[PDB]
Amino acid sequence: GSGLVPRGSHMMEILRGSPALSAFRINKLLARFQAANLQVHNIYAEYVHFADLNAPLNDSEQAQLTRLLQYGPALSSHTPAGKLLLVTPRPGTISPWSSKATDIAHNCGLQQVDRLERGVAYYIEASTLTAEQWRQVAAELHDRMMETVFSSLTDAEKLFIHHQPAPVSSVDLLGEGRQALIDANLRLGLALAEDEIDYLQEAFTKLGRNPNDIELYMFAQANSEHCRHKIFNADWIIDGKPQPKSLFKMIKNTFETTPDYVLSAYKDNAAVMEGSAVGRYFADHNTGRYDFHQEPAHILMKVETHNHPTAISPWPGAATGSGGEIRDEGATGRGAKPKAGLVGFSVSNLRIPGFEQPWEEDFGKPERIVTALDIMTEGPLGGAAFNNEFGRPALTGYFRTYEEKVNSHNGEELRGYHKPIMLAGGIGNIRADHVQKGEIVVGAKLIVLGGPAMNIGFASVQRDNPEMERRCQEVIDRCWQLGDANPILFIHDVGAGGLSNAMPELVSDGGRGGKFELRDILSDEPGMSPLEIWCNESQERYVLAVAADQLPLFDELCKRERAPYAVIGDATEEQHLSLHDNHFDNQPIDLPLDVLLGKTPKMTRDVQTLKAKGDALNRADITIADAVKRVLHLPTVAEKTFLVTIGDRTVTGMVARDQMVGPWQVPVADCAVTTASLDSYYGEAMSIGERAPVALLDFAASARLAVGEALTNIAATQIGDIKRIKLSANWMAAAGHPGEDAGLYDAVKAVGEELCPQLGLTIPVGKDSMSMKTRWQEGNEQREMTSPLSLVISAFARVEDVRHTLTPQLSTEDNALLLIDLGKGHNALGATALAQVYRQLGDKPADVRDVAQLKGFYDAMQALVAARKLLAWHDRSDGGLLVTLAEMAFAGHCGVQVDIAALGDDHLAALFNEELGGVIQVRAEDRDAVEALLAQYGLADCVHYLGQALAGDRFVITANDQTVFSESRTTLRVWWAETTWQMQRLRDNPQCADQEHEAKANDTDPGLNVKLSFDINEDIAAPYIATGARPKVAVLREQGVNSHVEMAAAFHRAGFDAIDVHMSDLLGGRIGLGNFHALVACGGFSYGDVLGAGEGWAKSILFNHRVRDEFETFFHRPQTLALGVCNGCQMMSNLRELIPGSELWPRFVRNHSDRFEARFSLVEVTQSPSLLLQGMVGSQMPIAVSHGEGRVEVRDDAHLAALESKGLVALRYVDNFGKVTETYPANPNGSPNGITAVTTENGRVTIMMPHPERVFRTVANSWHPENWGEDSPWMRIFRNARKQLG
Ligand SMILES: Nc1ncnc2c1ncn2[C@@H]1O[C@H](COP(=O)(O)OP(=O)(O)O)[C@@H](O)[C@H]1O
Ligand SMILES: [Cl-]
Ligand SMILES: [Cl-]
Ligand SMILES: [Cl-]
Ligand SMILES: [Mg+2]
Ligand SMILES: [Mg+2]
Ligand SMILES: [Mg+2]
């Protein structure tokens, strides 16, 4: 029986949940305790749930609540023993878990539930221990930045305290003079300049009234160098000479020179370029049916960083970095649709315990920040949690480690990334007449779309709820999908400054003022002051203007999606900002907009050039063999799987090229490619170029190389005209650090005024983060860790044919490998991975050697791509030619025999320079034609025949008759894997990490391979489609689901009319299942998987008796068909009681890896009654997997044997040898007997974890046999459905 006690005006129920930690996590905790000399005999942990009730539950409601709070894997339950430590969110905070779980309760009719929260009760047996050591135990069990530890369950009442609203406070300028502003500036941490203090003093003396804190806070944000970009708008004097252009004007030079294809630059959040005219697939507002709409899909692009918050709390830092950038995309124009993401990290040395590398030295860090290791453990998980749960695939990225004492521009000092680069970006699509924002009508309603606010903007500890952002995106999508009737007049993301930035910017951009009502804004924290409500940086919010007459439409759209919103003001003709408070009947803000948005003078930066003298590499301890080993262990170079498979790469159904390449799924793809629509071969490409360490020797060369590498990474994609490629430039520097300012100017000039104009590359978007350094006291000594100037270039392009992309996967057919050395034999070793791993900086770095030749290289690559003359491509970058060739051999699972005698006598420099260029593989018969073709672009003396790819395990580098380097390719491949192995091992289930790593050492692995039991080109649905009779399918979705459009598209290809059926449609009677003969429950993250993946969705059905009866009725009809995929499989497994023949079905629980798995996994189709798998039994082919809770769990061995004997298993993971497996990641989730689909006795209902709808197009299979046509094997599931309905 659960606890129930008074809690102010309410009652608080305390419910016991389930064991919270798996055995390996328990063992990890005990080992941490042993290692810190805390003698802990045992530890057990249990979730506990807290429900704050505004009215009582009856017996039935109580049983409902209890059932809602049963979820999770069925771990070993124990009777509590020893000391209780309860870990909860900090008082004053509300977990994302709380927001989601409380929505579930409400959708199951539990309106009495005011709020649910969760904690973890730890039961620690350690009968020794002093209270000092108890605080040390407690420290180990919580995150000090977001959680607190309590000694009683009943202390959870403090989480639900309701504080009375705090009033506005004035700053008494009139009563104290300027000192009041000075006091306020220090108290509120506004960081105002003297001349800003002067401006505010005058403005308010002029008005004759004291400013409120809220008005000062608002002004401080809107004027900080960041929001105002003072450095990038500054006048410069350098070495005594005035400069004619600001940094911004130099970036704009690129648009002045190359306007081509650009639709929007510097006037929104995202830049927009031309895309392709394609069939855009979405559900019509009138019919609810999914239809193709032939129109241009233009391409938006944006890249942002979130550096300081990630240094403090990396998980939410990364997660909200992604969340904010996703909102910028969605709020482009009058609404747009994010499509795919990219991710970047730069951090200091990892210093992985037990795997220290020889270049690494502990220099200490500030106590207030986390280590590089914690950033790379938790940060990628945060960014991926946002991308996965929002539903955008993350398809390209970079990850660099740098921390060294070097003799740079300011002499000998510590250079690194204690404050990291945390970068998030992406592309999206946007309609032609939404690229422009409108012109705000007077009396327009001004709306906040999204989450109830809390006091968030401890103040750098963010909080993310991606499911809220998904619900808002669905609204925005409905809006732009109305074309000319889109009701969004203007929209803007809410980010830095909260509403205090966003709403003034919304009305300003529309030439208007606003008047606002504070008490209309949705709030989860009644205590907040007007300052906190107006200025907090609570996440997942947008602001928009809608005409009064469209408000009923907007309301309907929001309610169907379950996206909260509030009309909070009206647009005024008068250009005044008014905020009123109905509670305190006063006016926290009453200001003309010109007063608020008032510029002090522009900055002048008067600076001088510092320039390091290089020092030639000391080679005394370097051999080629040792160097190969060290370089492959540099995380920058090394295999990146830990950053890739944690993130979904198939959501949308438009991913053509992800990071993982070939049958061996090696993450070496140089760029990302998406299709433009679900029915096109046109597309979009993304690449990244960065080379920060070079800036320690040469600022301008580091920038030129960033541009160059973005181009070399994208070059083997079919684009055509170089002017199609558009760049984002993100500039990270320690402004004011000696030499960095002049270097910044010179780098911006090097790209903006020189290289990009000459190549024809526009930079229509960009950002800057200008305090990339960290200071702290280490001994009695001041310490400082300062970043190199760090330009990250992201390149975006329209793609002419996604099928023609090349990867690094070498063929072993008769071939030639040719190096294109754009370094022209300079072979520079300064600031290379080679230099870094021997703790040096070296002498001269690479650089763009010849602009015409770089353009020539691009053009020549485009010609070879279009003529189908390349077998493979991989560019040269970190780790040089050696790494390029090794990675190609990894991807090809083969050997190379190369000769480097033509590349100079210095073999080390030939192999390890990081000059621009790369290796092309061509058919041996095409070698002379390819060489002549390259010669036509001026490249002859840069092109060198190296040798060939050969079947086998030999990686061999010769120079004439001398062996320069020779090793097992497998050995090198395993060395290169060691960093990801060790990361996975400390972050995930070490048993899984080890299994994955060990499989890499088996050269006999034949890679993904197929066996087909049917003809995959035979359209068995074609006779039905040809009659023109198209049966409906209910494509079912719930709040937070994300993969509903591609599911519809698969069914549509098989001849169905796909209907968009939200659970809100079933609940409002707008749709009835009695009108359908087929249903599908789609994937994604309903309710964010809170209360167990699929459970909230299922239980919202089961606890609403009418909708429940409707499902049951559907499933009991004699000819109805249903499919559940991923989240829908989870949902339907929780709905067993309504589905006949489902008694032996398992549950689907947390993966054994304890990690989200985004894999392209090999399965076989097994013999079952499943009607959707007819004709496919015995087939083996890969399929998209994307889930965290896919592990089949049975109630005991009896139930496993019964399920098996009944013959209801329909798909099983196999290894690449074709055998059923439980070894990871071949089986990605630990399901017994590889089980990942089941059917009912009648075969009419089938549920599966993988996503056949994501891979029905051959072009969307990460790897596939060359001879396939447009249809993959998985198309047959949807065709089988059509045919069965007859
Ligand atoms: N932070 C990351 N998140 C996702 N993928 C990443 C990340 N860092 C690198 N990758 C991917 O891993 C592969 C190897 O990356 P890297 O060796 O840095 O690329 P390159 O040397 O071609 O620039 C690429 O496909 C790249 O997109
Ligand atoms: Cl027990
Ligand atoms: Cl095959
Ligand atoms: Cl009802
Ligand atoms: Mg690389
Ligand atoms: Mg590359
Ligand atoms: Mg790179």
Coordinates of N, CA and C in Angstrom, one line a residue, residues 942-1028:
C942 N 50.6 16.8 -59.3 CA 50.1 16.5 -58.0 C 49.5 15.1 -57.9
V943 N 49.4 14.4 -59.0 CA 48.8 13.1 -59.0 C 49.8 12.0 -59.1
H944 N 49.7 11.0 -58.2 CA 50.7 10.0 -58.1 C 50.0 8.6 -58.0
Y945 N 50.3 7.7 -58.9 CA 49.9 6.3 -58.8 C 50.6 5.6 -57.6
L946 N 49.8 5.1 -56.7 CA 50.4 4.5 -55.5 C 50.5 3.0 -55.6
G947 N 49.5 2.4 -56.3 CA 49.4 1.0 -56.2 C 48.0 0.4 -56.3
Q948 N 47.7 -0.6 -55.5 CA 46.4 -1.2 -55.6 C 45.9 -1.8 -54.3
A949 N 44.6 -1.8 -54.2 CA 43.9 -2.6 -53.2 C 43.9 -4.1 -53.6
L950 N 44.2 -4.9 -52.6 CA 44.3 -6.4 -52.8 C 43.5 -7.1 -51.8
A951 N 42.8 -8.2 -52.1 CA 42.1 -9.1 -51.1 C 43.1 -9.5 -50.0
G952 N 42.8 -9.6 -48.7 CA 43.8 -10.1 -47.8 C 43.9 -9.0 -46.7
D953 N 44.9 -9.2 -45.8 CA 45.1 -8.6 -44.6 C 46.4 -7.8 -44.5
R954 N 47.1 -7.6 -45.6 CA 48.3 -6.9 -45.7 C 48.3 -5.5 -46.0
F955 N 48.8 -4.7 -45.1 CA 48.9 -3.2 -45.3 C 50.4 -2.9 -45.5
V956 N 50.8 -2.6 -46.8 CA 52.2 -2.6 -47.1 C 52.6 -1.3 -47.9
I957 N 53.6 -0.6 -47.4 CA 54.0 0.7 -47.9 C 55.5 0.4 -48.3
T958 N 55.8 0.6 -49.6 CA 57.2 0.4 -50.1 C 57.7 1.8 -50.6
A959 N 59.0 1.8 -50.7 CA 59.7 3.0 -51.5 C 60.8 2.3 -52.2
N960 N 60.6 2.2 -53.5 CA 61.4 1.4 -54.5 C 61.4 -0.1 -53.9
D961 N 62.6 -0.6 -53.6 CA 62.8 -2.0 -53.1 C 62.9 -2.1 -51.6
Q962 N 62.5 -1.0 -50.9 CA 62.6 -1.0 -49.4 C 61.2 -1.0 -48.9
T963 N 61.0 -1.8 -47.9 CA 59.7 -1.8 -47.1 C 59.7 -0.6 -46.1
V964 N 58.8 0.3 -46.3 CA 58.8 1.5 -45.4 C 58.0 1.1 -44.1
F965 N 56.9 0.4 -44.4 CA 56.0 0.0 -43.3 C 55.1 -1.1 -43.7
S966 N 55.0 -2.1 -42.9 CA 54.1 -3.3 -43.2 C 53.5 -3.8 -41.9
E967 N 52.2 -4.0 -42.0 CA 51.5 -4.6 -40.8 C 50.2 -5.3 -41.2
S968 N 49.6 -6.1 -40.3 CA 48.3 -6.7 -40.5 C 47.3 -5.5 -40.5
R969 N 46.5 -5.5 -41.5 CA 45.4 -4.5 -41.6 C 44.4 -4.7 -40.4
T970 N 44.1 -5.9 -40.0 CA 43.3 -6.2 -38.8 C 43.9 -5.6 -37.5
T971 N 45.2 -5.8 -37.3 CA 45.9 -5.2 -36.2 C 45.8 -3.7 -36.2
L972 N 46.0 -3.0 -37.3 CA 45.8 -1.6 -37.4 C 44.4 -1.2 -37.0
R973 N 43.4 -1.9 -37.6 CA 42.0 -1.6 -37.4 C 41.6 -1.8 -36.0
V974 N 42.2 -2.7 -35.3 CA 41.9 -2.9 -33.9 C 42.5 -1.8 -33.0
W975 N 43.8 -1.4 -33.3 CA 44.4 -0.3 -32.7 C 43.5 1.0 -32.8
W976 N 43.1 1.2 -34.0 CA 42.3 2.4 -34.3 C 40.9 2.4 -33.6
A977 N 40.4 1.2 -33.2 CA 39.2 0.9 -32.5 C 39.4 1.1 -31.0
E978 N 40.6 1.2 -30.5 CA 40.8 1.1 -29.0 C 40.2 2.2 -28.2
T979 N 40.1 3.5 -28.8 CA 39.6 4.6 -28.1 C 38.1 4.4 -28.0
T980 N 37.3 4.0 -29.0 CA 35.9 3.8 -28.9 C 35.6 2.6 -28.0
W981 N 36.4 1.6 -28.1 CA 36.3 0.5 -27.1 C 36.4 0.9 -25.7
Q982 N 37.4 1.7 -25.4 CA 37.6 2.1 -24.0 C 36.4 3.1 -23.5
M983 N 36.0 3.9 -24.4 CA 34.9 4.8 -24.1 C 33.6 4.1 -23.9
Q984 N 33.3 3.1 -24.8 CA 32.1 2.3 -24.6 C 32.1 1.5 -23.4
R985 N 33.2 1.0 -23.0 CA 33.5 0.2 -21.9 C 33.3 0.9 -20.6
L986 N 33.6 2.1 -20.5 CA 33.4 2.9 -19.2 C 32.0 3.5 -19.2
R987 N 31.3 3.6 -20.3 CA 30.0 4.3 -20.4 C 28.9 3.4 -20.5
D988 N 29.1 2.2 -21.0 CA 28.0 1.3 -21.3 C 28.3 0.0 -20.6
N989 N 27.5 -1.1 -20.9 CA 27.8 -2.4 -20.4 C 29.1 -2.9 -20.9
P990 N 30.2 -3.0 -20.1 CA 31.5 -3.4 -20.5 C 31.5 -4.7 -21.3
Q991 N 30.6 -5.6 -20.9 CA 30.5 -6.9 -21.7 C 30.1 -6.6 -23.2
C992 N 29.2 -5.7 -23.4 CA 28.9 -5.4 -24.8 C 30.0 -4.7 -25.6
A993 N 30.6 -3.7 -24.9 CA 31.7 -3.0 -25.5 C 32.8 -4.0 -25.9
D994 N 33.1 -4.9 -25.0 CA 34.2 -5.9 -25.3 C 33.8 -6.8 -26.4
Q995 N 32.5 -7.3 -26.5 CA 32.1 -8.2 -27.6 C 32.3 -7.4 -28.9
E996 N 31.9 -6.1 -28.9 CA 31.9 -5.4 -30.2 C 33.3 -5.2 -30.7
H997 N 34.2 -4.9 -29.7 CA 35.7 -4.7 -30.0 C 36.3 -6.0 -30.5
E998 N 36.1 -7.1 -29.8 CA 36.7 -8.3 -30.1 C 36.3 -8.8 -31.5
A999 N 35.0 -8.6 -31.9 CA 34.6 -9.0 -33.3 C 35.4 -8.3 -34.4
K1000 N 36.0 -7.1 -34.1 CA 36.8 -6.4 -35.1 C 38.1 -7.1 -35.4
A1001 N 38.5 -8.0 -34.5 CA 39.8 -8.7 -34.7 C 39.6 -10.0 -35.5
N1002 N 38.4 -10.3 -35.8 CA 38.1 -11.5 -36.6 C 38.1 -11.2 -38.1
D1003 N 39.2 -11.3 -38.8 CA 39.2 -11.0 -40.2 C 38.3 -11.9 -41.1
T1004 N 37.8 -13.0 -40.5 CA 36.9 -13.9 -41.3 C 35.5 -13.4 -41.4
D1005 N 35.1 -12.3 -40.6 CA 33.8 -11.7 -40.6 C 33.6 -11.4 -42.1
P1006 N 32.5 -11.9 -42.7 CA 32.3 -11.6 -44.1 C 31.5 -10.3 -44.3
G1007 N 31.1 -9.6 -43.3 CA 30.3 -8.4 -43.4 C 28.9 -8.7 -43.7
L1008 N 28.0 -7.7 -43.6 CA 26.6 -7.8 -43.9 C 26.5 -8.5 -45.3
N1009 N 25.6 -9.4 -45.4 CA 25.4 -10.1 -46.7 C 24.0 -10.7 -46.7
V1010 N 23.4 -10.9 -47.9 CA 22.0 -11.1 -48.0 C 21.7 -12.5 -48.6
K1011 N 20.5 -13.1 -48.3 CA 20.0 -14.3 -49.0 C 18.6 -14.0 -49.2
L1012 N 18.1 -14.1 -50.4 CA 16.7 -13.7 -50.7 C 15.8 -14.9 -51.0
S1013 N 14.7 -15.1 -50.4 CA 13.9 -16.3 -50.7 C 12.8 -15.9 -51.8
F1014 N 12.9 -14.7 -52.3 CA 11.8 -14.2 -53.3 C 12.5 -13.2 -54.2
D1015 N 11.8 -12.8 -55.2 CA 12.2 -11.9 -56.2 C 11.8 -10.4 -55.6
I1016 N 12.9 -9.7 -55.3 CA 12.6 -8.4 -54.6 C 12.1 -7.3 -55.6
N1017 N 12.2 -7.5 -56.9 CA 11.6 -6.6 -57.9 C 10.2 -7.0 -58.3
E1018 N 9.7 -8.1 -57.8 CA 8.3 -8.4 -58.3 C 7.3 -7.7 -57.4
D1019 N 6.6 -6.8 -58.1 CA 5.5 -6.1 -57.3 C 4.3 -6.8 -57.3
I1020 N 4.1 -7.6 -56.3 CA 2.9 -8.4 -56.1 C 1.7 -7.6 -55.8
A1021 N 1.8 -6.3 -55.5 CA 0.7 -5.5 -55.3 C 0.2 -4.8 -56.6
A1022 N 1.0 -4.9 -57.7 CA 0.7 -4.1 -58.9 C -0.7 -4.4 -59.5
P1023 N -1.2 -5.7 -59.5 CA -2.5 -5.9 -60.0 C -3.6 -5.2 -59.2
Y1024 N -3.4 -5.0 -58.0 CA -4.4 -4.4 -57.1 C -4.3 -2.9 -57.3
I1025 N -3.1 -2.3 -57.2 CA -2.9 -0.9 -57.5 C -3.5 -0.5 -58.8
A1026 N -3.3 -1.3 -59.8 CA -3.8 -1.0 -61.2 C -5.3 -0.9 -61.3
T1027 N -6.1 -1.6 -60.4 CA -7.6 -1.4 -60.4 C -8.0 0.0 -59.9
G1028 N -7.0 0.7 -59.3 CA -7.4 2.1 -58.7 C -8.1 2.0 -57.3

